[PDB]
Symmetry: C2
Subunit: 418 residues, 2 copies
């Protein structure tokens, strides 16, 4: 009913999710109790419409649509898996997954209809096949680089509970391990506390490398690599002090379930102070922002930024090069000892304009060469993608990530299973 109960529930069913994913990727038995956890988590969100979590001072109405849909699709997926597992006990998990009709499960969620879902699915499948064919030509597996939010994961009203489902995790991990030599994930949010590593349900130390702050931080191999480059050592740590001055403010009753909800990015802090249209009062937001301004201790190398009506930022800087996802990709590839210039295909997935640099860099290195899949892109963005790349023919546009997921599952069913 309250905030911490919701958060703890979601996080529990999420670590349970990771356990399930590990069990499905390492030929381990599927615990019916672990599934029961997700089942209870789903039943809890559907009883009292949406749900409203309250504390001892204020009350917030929270949109749990994404969490509910994720839990639902996961329940259907797992139910199927167990249904074929029971009928044939000692089959390998990929074979059982090859017998799952994921298409029928995901098609009912396409906002434009199943008919469009089918065509987008087929085109995405052929596109992906073109991407996979790179190995048979060059001898080495191609490189896959994607965005998270809106690209591989449906948009969530809260970043704090933007939890990745099981089927997508399994699909992405299998696809990355089987068909790619490099798979990278570039996000704007942090790695942890809460970050992409906490929201994901994937091996993390597997075939997929996760990043944060547009590539300024990475998780590999067992440690965290942070690229300051522009930010000073005093600009840094001061952000840490401010973060300490925020985490205790969250413990009072100011909340972090508003959009982004105070994120600690390598070079800045991004707090969500207001929700569209007007969740949370117009006054509490002002008290919030003023309290944030107070905890900025001159000045002291920390610059305040009102930014928008919904978000607010506290940045270090100013010496630097204005970091973007392109820099993250470049630095990663340079660090790994690989190259984008090497003859072979490159698949890049995105949903917003901030993903265009990733493409840019790629077509600067391999203009043969680059394949792009964009999710829910407006006309202008689609044209921009068509502009950065030559083709046109090398461009693929879908409406939702589930198209990509289903396509990948089909590719796995065809090439890894037969």
């Amino acid at each position: 009913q309250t905030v911490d109960d919701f958060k703890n529930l979601m996080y529990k069913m999420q670590e349970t999710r990771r356990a399930i994913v590990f069990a499905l990727l390492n030929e381990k038995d599927l615990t019916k109790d672990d599934v029961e956890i997700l089942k209870r988590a789903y039943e809890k969100l559907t009883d009292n419409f949406q749900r409203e979590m309250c504390t001892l001072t204020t009350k917030l109405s929270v949109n749990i649509g994404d969490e509910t849909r994720g839990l639902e699709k996961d329940l259907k997926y797992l139910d199927a898996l167990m249904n074929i597992r029971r009928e044939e006990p000692n089959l390998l998990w990929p074979i059982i997954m090859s017998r799952v009709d994921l298409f029928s499960i995901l098609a009912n969620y396409h906002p434009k209809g199943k008919e469009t879902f089918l065509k987008e699915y087929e085109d995405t499948v052929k596109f992906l096949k073109t991407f996979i064919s790179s190995e048979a030509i060059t001898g080495k597996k191609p490189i896959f680089i994607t965005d998270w939010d809106g690209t591989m994961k449906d948009y969530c009203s809260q970043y704090a509970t933007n939890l990745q489902p099981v089927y997508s995790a399994v699909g992405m991990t299998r696809f990355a391990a089987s068909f790619t030599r490099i798979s990278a994930v570039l996000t704007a949010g942090p790695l942890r506390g809460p970050g992409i590593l906490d929201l994901t349900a994937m091996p993390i130390d597997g075939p997929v490398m996760f990043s944060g702050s547009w590539g300024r931080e990475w998780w590999l191999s067992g440690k965290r690599v942070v690229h300051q480059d522009g930010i000073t050592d005093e600009g840094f740590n001061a952000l840490q002090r401010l973060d300490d001055e925020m985490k205790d403010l969250l413990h009072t009753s100011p909340f972090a379930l508003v959009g982004s909800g105070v994120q600690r990015k390598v070079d800045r802090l991004t707090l969500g102070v207001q929700t569209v249209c007007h969740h949370v009062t117009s006054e509490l937001s002002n008290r919030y922002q003023m309290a944030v301004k107070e905890r900025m201790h001159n000045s002291q190398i920390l610059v305040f930024d009102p930014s928008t009506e919904l978000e607010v930022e506290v940045v270090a800087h100013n010496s630097g090069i204005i970091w973007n996802k392109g820099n993250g990709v470049e630095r990663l590839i340079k660090s790994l000892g690989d190259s984008l210039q090497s003859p072979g295909k490159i698949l890049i997935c995105g949903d917003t304009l901030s993903d265009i640099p990733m493409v840019r860099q790629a077509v600067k290195q391999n203009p043969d060469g680059v394949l792009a899949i964009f999710v829910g892109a407006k006309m202008s963005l689609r044209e921009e993608v068509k502009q950065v790349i030559g083709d046109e023919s090398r461009c693929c546009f879908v409406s939702c990530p589930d198209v990509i997921h289903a396509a990948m599952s089909q590719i796995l069913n065809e090439h890894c299973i037969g």
Copy 2:
């Protein structure tokens, strides 16, 4: 209190606005009654918080913030003008306007503060000076091309009442006439019924040329020029028939005060069926969309498109080149007999990604050359602008159109008045 009362009130005070603008641009006396109209229009919107207009079936809560701010700023501006007019009866209007401290009037509306407003103002002024200096170098006045919504005009919750204030109209007209040889306005919405020509408070047949449908239609000189290019004659007129099948649906009680609110664009119809977050019920929207689907009479060259959760489109096509604002600029300049290649500076103003083509085309013709001012642009968009153009130094970023307006007013005060 109702819908039509609101619409008629706004339109009346808008034609009154045009009358006032004409009076201020042609050395005519300023009718105190015409000002009184705006005064009553302002008082009517501030009495009962926001306002809710209802009909005989449903009730809608309407955000009239933009209209109220426009009316308010207009009232202050006109009050000043009359205050110096009374103190010196037979002065020329530009001189009186040169004595108006518009900066103090507009600075209180900057969401980031007056301090930022000042710096953005100064930088924009110097930038504009650089733009004006082109005439003294090349002998001919430079070319100015801008976007409307979000660029020269604050965002409005309803396109039907997105009314341009007086001071901005005066400023833009004076600036365009005095410093430019070509001034163009590219919008996505139609020209009329309701269109940009109805929402503007500018001479229309003056120094500024207005367009619609990303340049597919233009108003010059006294007639409307429509570029089909891709759309067939049967694809056209069918859109007109559907439009006829919509305008009568609006007369029932389905409304067009939702965002865009059914727009007749040269190649398509863009209806606003849902508001963020959830103004209007979730069922009435469905009835709306289904009724729209019904009035599509095979099929019959009209393609339906769910697009987003808020908007919906009915497109003709498919043969064409996918028209953008760049094509509008190109076709306009080619039609007028001028050229972007000719040595001289080019100022381009925008707020979204759809304005990037305008820049693109320009830097394809004049890479010396192009100056860009972007309003309320996110980091990614700013970087994209910095990418399309070489400089960097030739880029100017502001937070609100009022910065541009105040800057232009200052330029007028310095060069046209002394």
